[PDB]
Design a protein around this motif. Structure first.
Motif, PDB file in Angstrom:
ATOM      1  N   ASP A 167       0.845  -1.206   0.000  1.00  9.17           N
ATOM      2  CA  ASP A 167       0.000   0.000   0.000  1.00  9.17           C
ATOM      3  C   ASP A 167       0.868   1.239   0.000  1.00  9.17           C
ATOM      4  O   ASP A 167       0.551   2.259  -0.642  1.00  9.17           O
ATOM      5  CB  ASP A 167      -0.939  -0.007   1.202  1.00  9.17           C
ATOM      6  N   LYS A 168       2.002   1.151   0.688  1.00 16.60           N
ATOM      7  CA  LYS A 168       2.854   2.325   0.807  1.00 16.60           C
ATOM      8  C   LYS A 168       3.546   2.608  -0.515  1.00 16.60           C
ATOM      9  O   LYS A 168       3.627   3.762  -0.953  1.00 16.60           O
ATOM     10  CB  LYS A 168       3.884   2.138   1.915  1.00 16.60           C
ATOM     11  N   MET A 169       4.062   1.556  -1.156  1.00  9.98           N
ATOM     12  CA  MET A 169       4.738   1.709  -2.437  1.00  9.98           C
ATOM     13  C   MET A 169       3.780   2.245  -3.507  1.00  9.98           C
ATOM     14  O   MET A 169       4.223   2.921  -4.433  1.00  9.98           O
ATOM     15  CB  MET A 169       5.374   0.348  -2.827  1.00  9.98           C
ATOM     16  N   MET A 170       2.486   1.929  -3.419  1.00  8.36           N
ATOM     17  CA  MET A 170       1.539   2.230  -4.497  1.00  8.36           C
ATOM     18  C   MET A 170       0.774   3.522  -4.288  1.00  8.36           C
ATOM     19  O   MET A 170      -0.127   3.833  -5.079  1.00  8.36           O
ATOM     20  CB  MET A 170       0.517   1.101  -4.652  1.00  8.36           C
ATOM     21  N   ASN A 171       1.082   4.256  -3.219  1.00  5.38           N
ATOM     22  CA  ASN A 171       0.465   5.555  -2.996  1.00  5.38           C
ATOM     23  C   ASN A 171       0.725   6.481  -4.185  1.00  5.38           C
ATOM     24  O   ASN A 171       1.871   6.871  -4.472  1.00  5.38           O
ATOM     25  CB  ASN A 171       0.958   6.156  -1.669  1.00  5.38           C
ATOM     26  N   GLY A 172      -0.336   6.823  -4.901  1.00  2.37           N
ATOM     27  CA  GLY A 172      -0.201   7.659  -6.087  1.00  2.37           C
ATOM     28  C   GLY A 172      -0.232   6.933  -7.418  1.00  2.37           C
ATOM     29  O   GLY A 172      -0.358   7.593  -8.457  1.00  2.37           O
ATOM     30  N   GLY A 173      -0.051   5.621  -7.432  1.00  2.00           N
ATOM     31  CA  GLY A 173      -0.150   4.885  -8.675  1.00  2.00           C
ATOM     32  C   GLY A 173       1.045   5.119  -9.572  1.00  2.00           C
ATOM     33  O   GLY A 173       0.903   5.100 -10.797  1.00  2.00           O
ATOM     34  N   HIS A 174       2.211   5.437  -8.997  1.00  2.00           N
ATOM     35  CA  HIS A 174       3.387   5.806  -9.802  1.00  2.00           C
ATOM     36  C   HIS A 174       4.137   4.610 -10.348  1.00  2.00           C
ATOM     37  O   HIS A 174       4.996   4.761 -11.240  1.00  2.00           O
ATOM     38  CB  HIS A 174       4.351   6.668  -8.985  1.00  2.00           C
ATOM     39  N   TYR A 175       3.894   3.423  -9.798  1.00  2.00           N
ATOM     40  CA  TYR A 175       4.460   2.180 -10.306  1.00  2.00           C
ATOM     41  C   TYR A 175       3.352   1.182 -10.624  1.00  2.00           C
ATOM     42  O   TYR A 175       2.233   1.302 -10.159  1.00  2.00           O
ATOM     43  CB  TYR A 175       5.381   1.521  -9.267  1.00  2.00           C
ATOM     44  N   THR A 176       3.728   0.105 -11.328  1.00  4.24           N
ATOM     45  CA  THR A 176       2.871  -1.057 -11.503  1.00  4.24           C
ATOM     46  C   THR A 176       3.343  -2.233 -10.627  1.00  4.24           C
ATOM     47  O   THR A 176       4.521  -2.589 -10.624  1.00  4.24           O
ATOM     48  CB  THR A 176       2.825  -1.413 -12.994  1.00  4.24           C
ATOM     49  N   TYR A 177       2.426  -2.843  -9.897  1.00  5.71           N
ATOM     50  CA  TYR A 177       2.847  -3.851  -8.928  1.00  5.71           C
ATOM     51  C   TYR A 177       2.904  -5.265  -9.498  1.00  5.71           C
ATOM     52  O   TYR A 177       2.067  -5.675 -10.301  1.00  5.71           O
ATOM     53  CB  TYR A 177       1.910  -3.826  -7.721  1.00  5.71           C
ATOM     54  N   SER A 178       3.872  -6.022  -9.034  1.00 10.64           N
ATOM     55  CA  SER A 178       4.054  -7.389  -9.442  1.00 10.64           C
ATOM     56  C   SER A 178       4.145  -8.206  -8.180  1.00 10.64           C
ATOM     57  O   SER A 178       4.679  -7.725  -7.172  1.00 10.64           O
ATOM     58  CB  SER A 178       5.323  -7.562 -10.212  1.00 10.64           C
ATOM     59  N   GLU A 179       3.676  -9.454  -8.262  1.00  6.27           N
ATOM     60  CA  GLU A 179       3.815 -10.435  -7.195  1.00  6.27           C
ATOM     61  C   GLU A 179       4.902 -11.453  -7.491  1.00  6.27           C
ATOM     62  O   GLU A 179       5.038 -12.436  -6.758  1.00  6.27           O
ATOM     63  CB  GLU A 179       2.479 -11.141  -6.961  1.00  6.27           C
ATOM     64  N   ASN A 180       5.693 -11.234  -8.535  1.00  7.25           N
ATOM     65  CA  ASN A 180       6.836 -12.100  -8.767  1.00  7.25           C
ATOM     66  C   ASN A 180       7.845 -11.982  -7.620  1.00  7.25           C
ATOM     67  O   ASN A 180       8.008 -10.928  -7.009  1.00  7.25           O
ATOM     68  CB  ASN A 180       7.511 -11.737 -10.073  1.00  7.25           C
ATOM     69  N   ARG A 181       8.544 -13.063  -7.347  1.00  9.44           N
ATOM     70  CA  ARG A 181       9.455 -13.046  -6.192  1.00  9.44           C
ATOM     71  C   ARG A 181      10.634 -12.103  -6.430  1.00  9.44           C
ATOM     72  O   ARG A 181      11.178 -11.498  -5.492  1.00  9.44           O
ATOM     73  CB  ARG A 181       9.927 -14.478  -5.930  1.00  9.44           C
TER      74      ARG A 181
END
Lengths: 188, 188
Positions: free
Chosen positions: A130-144
């Protein structure tokens, strides 16, 4: 002809996430500097392991450039990284020269704080999403382990070996990574 | 009501094999003492990571007993353990009181040097097999983690997480091990 790595070590860093990449990278023949954020003095990691850095970050900054800058995790360690102006300068310079930036677990959140690599695919610890995605500036991945352009990220202490070997593969190639991996007795 | 662990740290120890169990065991609520074989001074591990011990082994010896004694690997570290008379005394006492003895990678070879646990099934790093088996005093296993009676052994840096969690499970039980494991983001 020797590649160079900078590992930035702050109070509260996850000590496993610090030692595993340093060790593996040195097995691969990389010159690693463990640089203490606050100076040359010993650093109390998150689980009270105390590590002596190789140099202060101030001194290490002057002996660049580095082929990879490595940001360990641990919640308080990442917060100290995210607040440091010296880190900001180091990261911004590494991005401009298109060098590799590697961060694991909570470490990637320093990238956000310092406005580093917007638009890239990244992963973090699940608890840091949640902290990393504040603002939508990156795209999230669940890859290790995740690598997008010059940004390499990984998820937690248990991914530390895969994260380190990905750095080796990026710097020294797949054959060296495979050679360093075999004596470690990893499962996959 | 708190379990206690002693980790014996000598020059040349494998720093990953030292930090990972210490960290995990402290996540499990175990009181860990990182005790330096030669004194309280900082210890240069095999890949040049420098760790500050919590106490000298002399002092730590006086604050026993411990529910587990932990021997990290690294070739030179194990050799320093195998030569130390203080280690011999600590191990012999731990065996007599039927406490747990845990050793990883090259660490198990100190058991042989100190005539500890003959007849038990053990594993080591593949490269340490011939040395551990001189005399036929143990039975060898290729399992990544091996436990026979009070002797728990494991194979190398890449088994460090499984080794540590096995200590947790032995001391605190399967439920605590499973709770400490989930946030680590291990694969299996």
């Amino acid at each position: 002809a020797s590649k160079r790595a900078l590992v930035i070590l702050a109070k509260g860093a996850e000590e496993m996430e610090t030692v595993i990449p340093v060790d593996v990278m040195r097995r691969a023949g990389i010159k690693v500097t463990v640089a203490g954020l606050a100076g040359k003095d010993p650093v109390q990691c998150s689980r009270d392991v105390v590590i002596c850095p190789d140099a202060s970050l101030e001194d290490a900054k002057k002996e660049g450039p580095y082929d990879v800058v490595v940001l360990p995790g641990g919640n308080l360690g990442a917060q100290n990284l995210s607040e440091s102006a010296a880190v900001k300068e180091i990261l911004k310079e590494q991005e401009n020269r298109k060098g590799l930036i590697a961060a694991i677990c909570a470490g990637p959140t320093a990238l956000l704080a310092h406005e580093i690599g917007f638009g890239s695919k990244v992963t973090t610890h699940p608890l840091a999403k949640d902290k990393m995605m504040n603002g939508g500036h990156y795209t999230y991945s669940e890859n290790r382990v995740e690598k997008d352009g010059l940004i390499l990220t990984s998820r937690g202490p248990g991914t530390s070996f895969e994260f380190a070997l990905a750095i080796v593969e990026a710097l020294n190639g797949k054959e060296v990574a495979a050679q360093v991996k075999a004596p470690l007795v990893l499962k996959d």
